Amino acid sequence: DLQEKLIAVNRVSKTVKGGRIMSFTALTVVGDGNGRVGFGYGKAREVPAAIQKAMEKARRNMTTIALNEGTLHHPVKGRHSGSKVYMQPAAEGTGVIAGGAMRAVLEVAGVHNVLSKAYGSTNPINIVRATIDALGSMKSPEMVAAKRGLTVESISE
Amino acid sequence: ARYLGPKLKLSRREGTDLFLKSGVRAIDTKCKIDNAPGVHGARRGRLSEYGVQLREKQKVRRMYGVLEKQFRNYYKEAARLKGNTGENLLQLLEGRLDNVVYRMGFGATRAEARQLVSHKAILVNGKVVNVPSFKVAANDVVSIREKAKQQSRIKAALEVAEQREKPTWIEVDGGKMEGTFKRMPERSDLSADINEQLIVELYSK
Amino acid sequence: SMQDPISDMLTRVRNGQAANKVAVKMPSSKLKVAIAALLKAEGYIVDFAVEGEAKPELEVTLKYFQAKPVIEQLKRVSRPGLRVYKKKDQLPSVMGGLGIAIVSTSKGLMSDRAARKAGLGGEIICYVA
Amino acid sequence: KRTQQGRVVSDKMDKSITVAIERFVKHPIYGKYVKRTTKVHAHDENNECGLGDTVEIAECRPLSKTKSWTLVKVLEKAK
Amino acid sequence: MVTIRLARHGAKKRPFYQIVVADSRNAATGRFIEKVGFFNPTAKGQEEGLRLDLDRVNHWVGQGASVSDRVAKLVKDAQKAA
Amino acid sequence: ATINQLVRKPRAKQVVKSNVPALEACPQKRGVCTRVYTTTPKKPNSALRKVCRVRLTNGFEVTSYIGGEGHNLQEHSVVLIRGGRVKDLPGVRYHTVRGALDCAGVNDRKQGRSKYGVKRPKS
RNA sequence: UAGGUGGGAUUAGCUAGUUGGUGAGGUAAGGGCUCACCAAGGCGACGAUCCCUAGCUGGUCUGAGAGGAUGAUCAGCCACAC
RNA sequence: UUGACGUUAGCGACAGAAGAAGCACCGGCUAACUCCGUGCCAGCAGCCGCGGUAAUACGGAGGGUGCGAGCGUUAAUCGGAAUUACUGGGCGUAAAGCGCAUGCAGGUGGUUUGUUAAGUCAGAUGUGAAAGCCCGGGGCUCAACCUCGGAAUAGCAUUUGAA
């Protein structure tokens, strides 16, 4: 499987005695639409090579997230650098109500119904890190019951 | 208003068939369907998420021949209604009389269907309805007035609709020229080419 | 001055769990012990014990699972500087129902679940998740 | 018998206690509970009460421009 | 005086009357004491033409409420309905 | 800020300002041109930009831009002004509504005509 | 009667029928409502006084909400009629 | 005998595609690109900017996009703005710790028994106009609209409990 999205391309510069070496950063996200998601950030002097590098990096850095059949089990907060993300489970039909970067991550991860907001910096590179920080923080009701030595019933009763 | 202008052009933009002609000739034989309209038609590339969403919304509007103000109201109802906003929107579009006289086969297109409806050809439960956008309910009986039972366009369109797959939520006696909207279609019943999700997303954006 | 012993209890637990401490001791009190009892019931601590008669100390044994601390969140809600009382229909859900909120009702100190089932509101002490 | 308790906060008027009634209210915005105070000139026929006393007053007919409360009962006299 | 009278609501050309107890001095469509029923002069299908709480009508008449001629006829109609 | 601080002094609403103070919250305003001149943009930009000093009905004197190629505005012309900064021209906060009162449509415009007051070409 | 209902502290004191008492008058009716007399009270940092703005409400608009903005039409209340 | 509306709605019958499409935009944001004219001029512009010779930014044209009996502009409110942050922000260096302290009012306050029940919580009763909003219906060919029932009115008063 592995759906791969390109969140951002950006032209960066190193100043040099000559003039300016201009290069390209690519922020990509990969996942299986069913719990795995990874990001990759690649650099190169050509755009295709950056995307390629990012994709390769992404594949290696993928991570399980506990989803509730296309939504979250509970609300989560993420933070990275100055980017803060809130995401909340939603009813089916809602769609991914996330903003930029955050929606790419949620697409490939397999979230179809979520409510989001991104506070603070909306810098793609940081949002993506916050989003996957948050998706990492999610636990299934079973996991939460396992940890508290109770049953899914008793947790919710 | 109703969009009165060239039909296949729309299909070319949307990059698909919207069934805006009767399927007696293949859309590809009547137009360069794989090129968009105009002088930059053979130059397609990156569309934005916004553009992607926009297109999907327009795909569905243009299929059913609804303008934006109406379409946006449908979305608002689909939202208000209980359950899946995406599905509700499709069942709202599928419940329209101009669509329902097309699904039954009285009209060869959804635009002929609409003329039939406007021109007072159609009864619903034996009363004359000439509002395209009327919401045919479950177990309603859409029929053709005895006056119009002799229109050869109708007879034509029935055999055109034989060439398509049957709606399993509509029953039609084309001999008596009456149909029953048995029930509202499910999401499964309709095209899975439609990504309703994107249209919901467009109307949050 | 220390003007919120409950928050001090929670801090001590939160910092203990962070430092991978086995147990945490603090000056005991009724409400501290009551909280500790609920946290045991809900499976967030291992156990507690109140030693001493003159100046009683409380010892919460902390709980780890897969070498992560069981308590993720331990946020105090009703501070001294801003008390928080919710009616039964307005009780906070924590971690989408998977965490507790310790309510103090007039029939004792209970989770938000048990408070809702009891149709009691009360003072919101903290969120445990 | 909807009375209200309070504390005498002036007594210098003849036959009149100013009584400070104290309500504890949640703040509309910020959520904090907050002492707020109604002063309410009551009528004291006998000049019983003294600055500091805790009295129970009851609403009555207007007895002056500012007095439409009356002393029911002194609850706790001052030190 | 207190009167039981029709208060026109509805739309242009489609009058729908609330039967109200009111001080006579008010505008017919303004301050009323109690709504005791309604009268749809052009009711179709399942829509009721006349609801009127006769108990409340009698209550008010017994307190010296007048009835308008129209409400007086609808009271008869609500009694031939009873 | 602490709650008790906010209870003592609540968070202050922010006084916003209109960029079009002369309009006095009206969609347009009539004025009489007192001077119809040209001015040079702020630099990076280079042009001769057609403007009018206008005395409005509310007694404000303001400078309005006169947009589109060519105009018929002398001193004493009665014009309608709307809001609209010209970024290049420091001072100019209003546009002269073309095609309204004494101001005429831009001659021989054929796209965006409504914005310039020109009627539809008789085809 | 109580609570609620704009802005300004580069507006901090304000009040002397003023605040309360007694009696008389007066009113449909309690009441400084008025007068005489006695006392010196009353209000105010939980913002009196002053200044600016403003009819109030049901609602309306916006907002995930909490809020923010607003008070045409309709209905209630108030005020006014060169 | 009583209809202002009134030549009423609603129905039929005729005849014929017959009588009926604009407006903004197409440099990025933002859906839609080319060619000519122009040459820091003329002009554009919400923001970033565009124009000094191959201008997808100016003007026209062709083509396209959006919307449609409208479409644009201006004004105005909220939103986005977590950019006054209660929900929901900050203050080493970005704006922000009073130079330091003492201290009244205020805010807050250790442990514990009992009591009280002001705060808190639960319930009852009264009230919270009607309309509106929302949910189910009902009636207009549909819709707007009208309308029935409910929910709501997060409050307040009285009252009974919990502690």
Ligand SMILES: CN[C@@H]1[C@H](O)[C@H](NC)[C@H]2O[C@@]3(O)C(=O)C[C@@H](C)O[C@H]3O[C@@H]2[C@H]1O
């Ligand atoms: C003195 N010779 C210099 C010296 O080799 C410089 N490197 C330290 C070298 O640096 C270059 O290679 C650069 O990259 C910069 C450029 C301006 O000059 C180039 O040529 C530079 C040579 O001219």
